[PDB]
């Protein structure tokens, strides 16, 4: 098992219709932020509001990304979640507006159900039946095609259209192969060769596959999940044809293009047409952009434009700044690096720094998840380090202590282990103190 | 062999015992008895593989051994584990974004292991007999394959005959056939039939006839990085993008699909994940958005262990207007553990110079080595290291085997360090081009 | 154009359209830079750079060919040497939809999975109309 | 007939067997220490044992750094690769600068392959294929003026023969190893079958049909890298019209470089190839950004890196890409640790006079003694390059007066007609509106 | 041939010089600038000798002093079959080439290779053509009768001659040229036979003719590179050609000159407004001038001590001192009254304008007062005002009307400077309304 700075958080930890408790879901403290995130989860599950922005702000190492992952865990794996960094919007292929729109459309999911009728199994016979009165100037005038199927606890012969014989000849279907017949479209295809013919020849490069189970004929309801961006990039590219341009573009580098609003409008039109029949279901998700201080003001104005759309999902922003200038402007001093036009459109959630006991419990649970055993005195020294230097510095000094314990053939973490880890690895403060007092051209 | 003597090629692994205790001088590296212990802890961290996404920082003055420490970690890591070593200026690309270049450098340093068991039939084709049925839907074949030792006869299929009609083989053709997978290759032509056709042609090549048995069993273990799977699963013919670099901003949905695919392979059990180390030399000259993406990209499960080296003090971070310690912002320094390297003394410089002259096949006297040690205390170490190789050629021009004090003095006279060049520029500043472009060409005033 | 015009039992109609702009090239450049002869090394260097030192040659780089065959799933190990040595238009013209083995590192994406359903799908289906 | 451009009186470093340098020998005057250090560098390069050796030579303008680098390239010989470069050429609009630096690094490592050229040529007398439909072999009979000779051929060369539309009586060209087929044209014995025909007629070859020749092929690692990394595909031998899509330079993956190194090492181990490391010379290194200066630190630590020579004339100058960095010669302190600095000294009056006499000798001009003294005084007063540039208008003005020897009057007219930088600046300062 | 209405430098047919390189006061459309014309004649002899290479000269002076006139005089005095490249300082700033690559292409476009080849040709007038077909039409037989003013003959045609004559249909009385070795036949025209129009050819029907070819190094560089064909010489997408093919072209050209099959003809590269190049381009120019295949570079600039581009300091002529160290400088001077009136009389003769003496004196006075180009622009625009009143010669009233209608620099600045509330300033402030 691999653990990387997370995966000790499972959900938020609220009860039903009530206050989140202190010890639940891997969270310690941050009670008001957890209640606000639970209300946000309920608003997402209501499936009614569109284009809502929530900016959650605080100091470094407070639990912003932990709360975003708790949002994604509480919503479930069926609800889409697109984690975005603010540096990802700048590309050298398309404009940043198109990248923002693509990541915007990636957060809306569609649930499509369909009933499929199939005819699969091993081919028993293949006889193109001739007509009673053949036409002159031709040979082997097919009246119908007789195809016999064989599956596990099932055998059925079928009458086919004469036009299926061209598909039989095209895909090279012989006796003993296993096939897969769609009902309405016809369009047979070769799954492979049956396992009973695996020892037919000495040397043969042929896919051998097991005989399929169940009856030859079955009705299955298949629920498929796609996002709107997949529909956009599939409708945008030209379908499978015989022109040189399509296969030449398939054989080349797939450079992104600025998808027009007309294609998105028609996609929304046909999607709404298939919701109102009761077939499809629309699932909005969360587009999470953290460290939004790196965004340019043009992206902020396009966010202002794009948040008014009908199909827009909920977007969650995170920032750790105070009174800083917005990038791209030299005088707009603004809170959290966000221009005041966007700030009026969003609700602000505040996260608070921790204490002695919260840092101690966080270190204890992180050592529990990392499969390590620590003593009481080592835990108290680690908590003193966490409230002295940084919480993340105390969290990153656990596994090297486990290595130093395993070097001395001990499964216990004690005081001299964390003292050796202090003497080996430095934090930022002692590094800066070394830098400030050294004049060796460093 | 296509390797010459590089700058630090004496370093073969970290000089540690079983208890992670560094020796004073062993297998290449001299001194630095705490950075070696910390790098051994980092090596055991990588070799355990149970944790992911942690960055360490190697900070110290220049000419101390940070990249020597990285080379030692790379050499003691061994094979089959990926080790990507990039510089800070490589990510600024004209055809690729900075963040996607960072993502490709992250995913080039973590791979999976695939085990393949093969059954190879390598031999010379003597005769092919093709038989058809009455219906003619399927074709049967006879293969007469011959080794130096023995010869036997196999059977063909319809797909085998169809795949042998492609890449035309005749008598005297060296082929190899896998039993399990049906892989087909044409090794070339035997040397026994190199005198009949009187002219070779363009597509032909001559290989020796194999010996030994026909059906040889051998297993192969493949190590495939995640970036290779990303490049392959993004295009119709993607290996040319692997060898030419024109991948061009691979979409994230195929990366999530490949991550789920690798998780499915690990749970089912046909592959296992081999983590690795990504080394970024001179990380101080990276843009602040790259630092932000490094901060947020280390929390994924498929993230390697990052090593960064910086020789800067409190300097200005690129892309911003302020000054920060080590040229890096405080959010990245919070997500780090710093390894500090310290400068050497006379004995360590003496041992390092002795090792470097030992590898370069240069024989020094004791007094010449003492003079080189004094110069390495006064000037930098690399000046003495280059003076060794120059003075060896000075000794060969004098028809002498071992170098002497006179060769080191001649090399010191003929070649200059930084301080003497600075002084000689400063006392003759009129003959060099100033910042304002002012210079004097004429020597008579 | 400067074609063959008439200055006025069948009549011949042959395509003879040319361009009025003429680029004149001496014979020496052609015969000493583009055509092989005894005193130049065009064919020798072409073979040396395309066959002997090619990294897709199975007679010298069998490990890379086996690695790429595991990666892609090509049934033939000479496919990469053939792909790397013919022009792009020739490659796209004669491309054949040959089968690939399942035990490989590459399978189908979601978009292509949606794509292969609607090759011959009729109307009024939801996935075809979408 | 003969051309002269600022050089070509430089034939070598001009050293004896002991490594010391004479005063006036090999076209070089003065600067004994720099020439001796350059000879030491030449011997180190000829040792073929070290990689990533960086050398900086520094001095004032018109002192002879480029002449010294050209002397290095002449002393090493034509077998050793030499890649001259200016620092401005690393900036391109197709790829990043680091990839261009890597290409210029790998351009300086060469190989030597020994190959044999075997050629059949002559008039075709018999072309009789036969089937084994598939043809098993074709037999071709060739005729020249010294006899005839028949050959069995593989069917691929028969296909290439059918590509050139070869019939009976056509003079053709077959290379035995490569397999290329070139149709020269129809023979003169069939020139009177028609009075007018669209077929050119060539005579029979006067030599044998069979020709055997041993040749040496010199390639570098960059040629193999660009041969193995064509993105569009393999090119045909003859394509006078361009490709349908324009090939552009790409970022070459280091895995391809690893495979090229593996193949080259395999061919070296069989005794076919010989490795010749060379020199990468970069003039005006102060025009480089700090990113390339950082990437040079990584690129000098490779095991296959060549010997790098840098030349600069700046003093305590700000490095490009920085605002508050002052460094000697425009070279950052992280990189200036790794090289060895060779100093280059300015010249005196007698050295300038000898340089002017040598330049008048190589340009095939005759000058007087007093004209030489006046040109030496002018060179010491304005610049050394001014007299060298003014030598040839003096010869032209002497030629227009029907004389073969330059005198003081022609030097006076050349001084009057053409100005230097100092007089042009003094005109620029005392002028009303833009000179 | 070389269609042109009227150029601004159309009167300069070359440098007016004697056999002793002495400038006449009025010859070949050039007047004044005696020392500059003598220096340009010396540079012309340096180009024509061809024994030295890679020398850069600089033409610096005040604006409107005839620097471009000197460059056009040198270009016309060189004549044909010698390369002459004239580029501006803003042309090299490309989006798909680098600056060094564009400078390299401009350097190699200015040196050429002279190759002499001979090709045997047939050209005459077609008398009569027979095409014969068999019963099945498999074999085609033909006879062609072709004549000149001195002979007549009949040729027995093969199959490919028959297909080459049926295509691009040739009738009787047609004058054609036939290349046997390539199969290309071109129709010259029609003969003078009433019973385009070209006369009948004379002499022998089968002529061995020698054609002298001149091809630049950039053309062989483009053709030798396999990435793009010869169509990139016209489309213009060469795209950063590698140095290896340049080295092969250098070695091949050197061995061709050594064998004697080809000669090297160097030329002149003229850079106009050289002060607007970056310092990287200047640094490339310093090290590109010592190659064996380097042309003679002419630069023209008119600036004083100004800021060099890409830097933060000021330099004489807008160029760095190391570039000026390898240059010999020709300085041009301002004109007098007599030279101005002679220039205006020559421009009158080239613009088919008849001028009175008083109109010429008024133009000379207003040219000395303001600008030479202002008078040279007013002289052509006064003729239309003269033709509006229907008289041929331009009088004083037409020149005064043109002076009233069309302004110059100084009067426009004077009119702006007390009306600046009506014009947009540096801060974007303007007043539109008449009142308040
Ligand atoms: N309330 C909490 N409960 C448990 N762990 C926490 C809590 N807050 C922060 N952490 C831990 O701190 C580490 C860093 O927090 P992070 O999400 O980076 O905060 P921020 O986003 O504010 O920088 C995470 O690995 C997380 O597990
Ligand atoms: N511990 C060490 N043992 C042996 N050699 C060393 C050691 N540290 C540094 N060196 C030598 O110093 C030279 C340059 O030092 P380097 O590792 O580049 O320092 P830095 O990484 O700080 O720039 C290398 O060639 C290496 O041989
Ligand atoms: N020692 C010397 N002997 C002969 N000629 C010299 C010498 N030094 C310099 N030169 C000549 O001076 C000219 C300019 O020198 P150059 O190499 O450009 O110096 P830099 O490169 O420092 O500007 C060259 O053409 C060279 O031939
Ligand atoms: N000596 C001269 N002889 C003939 N025409 C001249 C002479 N000097 C200048 N001119 C004319 O002056 C006009 C403008 O001069 P121009 O050469 O454009 O100025 P500049 O040298 O600043 O470019 C040109 O049409 C040119 O013909």
Residue numbers in the entry:
A (entry chain X): 22 to 463
B (entry chain Y): 16 to 460
C (entry chain Q): 1029 to 1036, 1069 to 1190
D (entry chain T): 21 to 152, 161 to 463
E (entry chain U): 15 to 209, 220 to 460
Study text:
Unlike other chromatin remodelers, INO80 preferentially mobilizes hexasomes, which can form during transcription. We group subunits of the INO80 complex into four modules: Rvb module (Rvb1/Rvb2), Arp8 module (Arp8/Arp4/Actin/Ies4 and Taf14), Ino80 module (Ino80/Ies2) and Arp5 module (Arp5/Ies6). The Ino80 protein consists of three major regions: the N-terminal domain (NTD), the HSA region (Ino80HSA) and the ATPase domain (Ino80ATPase).
In class 1 of the INO80-hexasome structure, Arp8 engages with the ~35 bp of DNA unwrapped from removal of the H2A-H2B dimer and an additional ~5 bp of flanking DNA. In class 1, the hexasome is almost identical with the unbound hexasome, without detectable additional DNA unwrapping. While the INO80 architecture appears similar to that in the INO80-nucleosome structures, a major difference is that it is rotated ~180° on a hexasome compared to a nucleosome. When INO80 binds to a hexasome, the Arp5/Ies6 regions used in the context of a nucleosome are repurposed for different interactions. We observe that Ino80ATPase engages the hexasome predominantly near SHL −2. The placement of Ino80ATPase near SHL-2 is consistent with how the ATPase subunits of other remodelers bind the nucleosome. We further propose that the new contacts made by the Arp5/Ies6 module with the exposed H3-H4 surface provide an anchor allowing the Ino80 motor to efficiently pump DNA through the hexasome.
